[model samples]
Target chain A: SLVELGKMILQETGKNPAKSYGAYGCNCGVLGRGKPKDATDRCCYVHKCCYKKLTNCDPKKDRYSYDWKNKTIVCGEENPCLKQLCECDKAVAICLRENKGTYNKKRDVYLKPFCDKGRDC
Target chain B: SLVELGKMILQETGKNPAKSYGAYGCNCGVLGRGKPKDATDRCCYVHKCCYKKLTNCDPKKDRYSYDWKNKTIVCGEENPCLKQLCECDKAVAICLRENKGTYNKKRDVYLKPFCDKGRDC
Candidate 1:
């Protein structure tokens, strides 16, 4: 336990705060800044917040692929963050929109994508 | 619980058991049979059975998509038999197996495909 804590400190010590990282950036928005008070952007609140903080990388995926021996994230496609940024924007869209683009009416916690771009009531 | 269980039992009835279908004759084998069940034919046991049963359809998707008003299976891809077939089969296979066929882990509790090629697995 002591050694594990020590290693965590070592890893976190050099992390710089100069660049944007983690949740709640000072001014960064999901896709744009100053989007709107009640308007949705990038995605709904939780997903946008999660992606911005995590740096296009998923902590869940990271949890599965972490190399215990190396004490670091793995490499390759299995390691999504390493392969490339996750498709968080689109992923979040599915989550928030109940799969609006597809043919399913998956109900999220709340109904979303309430206003269609060009569909009429 | 009674209402829910009663609903499920009611739904299972009048289900056709004619011809060949459901989790056994999936052009594959299960648990070991009268053929070349070595190295592997394709996926493995549980997956094949799972595919054959359910008429190559899935119960979870069916569960999420059943119409209470009509008490009937809804017509749509969202009602993914493939999605469920792959999942329950692969899921069980993975549970008992491991990415071998389904890519999860051991095929929990054993399963068979309900229907495939209009034939029961």
Candidate 2:
């Protein structure tokens, strides 16, 4: 546990360490220039923000990969984000939109992409 | 797509399709043969029920594997169900319990098992 934690801290210092992970610059309209929100931007809400902050990458343009060991987002060099389309991807995108993208409809949750590990819905 | 649908129909007859899925025998107290419920048990809610109906095997007892192409659950014969322990497995179990196994707390979602395919969280 301590070893993995140490790795995460090390990776944090490698990229976008100063950028943050969640809602700080979220919907900031312009995506830049403001005082620190003093919040950790490490989760979903803002990881995208950090991706852009560090790489100036567009998710729609190129996919970004995440390093589980580092809690870091890999924007270039074998970018991990998905760029191609597939069965579950389409299904999930539809389901996500059907639920307005913020929440999942119970029935539609299983209709998601099998992009992660583990089994079952 | 039509071919896949055909396979699902075939698989349904082979197992619990007649038993139905979701909330039908859900929490039916003791599993029994009471209904010819008009509902189709093709989705999540009743998949577990169908599993038990076909094999009387418990998820707690044996792990099951889903044939995406067939939309069928293989419970016996090399039993696809899980009976082992691993990292993500433990992590996800904890996350599920923390959320009462009903929903996920977004903050902890990534802490789940990387049990699916493709990539990312």
Candidate 3:
């Protein structure tokens, strides 16, 4: 369960898994903001709010990594705050998995052109 | 650590230990109210707020018991809400332990005279 996993993360790290990562929309790091594009994007938006409310974690300074082989999201830092940020990411991952059907691949491709040109739509 | 214990309680039961018990001041159940007598009493007050915000647990229906032989607190019901109430009590026990020096026995005795008489002081 997500709650159990969240509790484990907190016990091992002395941080709340739900309030760690700073995010906006579906984009990673500091770039994405504004209205969420979909249910998956909304998860990231909520995560962004959780981070903003709980910790002073800067998105650029505290970043996350993907363990490609293990298929896990890794926090770059070991400290409580950064670990919490990772937790936020983990929550989003779970949320994304649950809301996979809501993801719009075609919309993502269409938005990429304008997003790449630093245009807002 | 309280955080670890809180996490453990949450894991064992699908509830947040912090928001389980409904209380007011240093009193148990629905009797006590108003300003807390001291720091120890303040812990119960905060716990009361946690319960009011989180669960629909009624103090009259759910109650806690003390294990005289084991010197432990027990929740009457095994369900999540009752378990959470026990967690709230556990937190207060920990809080009381930390603030033992702040507990004024003289004040308690004096207040008891009026409290037992059902008179507001």
In TM-score terms, which candidate is top?
Answer: 3
The list of candidate 1 runs beyond 4 A from truth reads A1-84, A87-121, B1-43, B47-97, B101-121
Error of 3 at B84 (Å): 46
Model 3 CA lDDT for position A101: 52
Q: Which stretches of candidate 3 lie over 4 Å from their true place?
A: A1-32, A63-77, A112-121, B1-121
Query: For model 2, how does the per-residue alpha-carbon lDDT over B34-118 read when each residue is reduced to its tens digit?
Result: 3322122112223233334333334333333323211212222333233121111222222222322232223121332222221
User: lDDT of each structure?
Assistant: 0.30, 0.25, 0.46
How does residue B19 of candidate 1 score in lDDT?
12
The sequence of per-residue lDDT tens digits that candidate 1 reaches over residues B38-67 is 222233344445545666444433333222
The CAPRI category of model 1 is: incorrect
The better-scoring model by TM-score among 2 and 3 is 3
Residue B2, model 1, lDDT: 18
Model 2 lDDT, full chain set? 0.25
Q: Write the per-residue lDDT of candidate 1 for residues A32-92, one digit (tens) a residue.
A: 2232122222233434454446555553333322121122222224445423323333233
CA shift at B103, candidate 3, in angstroms? Answer: 52
- Candidate 3 shows a clash count of 3
lDDT of 3 by residue, A1-121 (tens): 2343343334333344444322323442235544665665666565565566445655335554423111233444565666676667566555654554564554443343133321233
Model 2: how far residue B118 lies from native, Å? 39
Give the 10-residue window scoring lowest on summed lDDT in candidate 1 chain B: B13-22
Candidate 3 lDDT score at position B11: 36
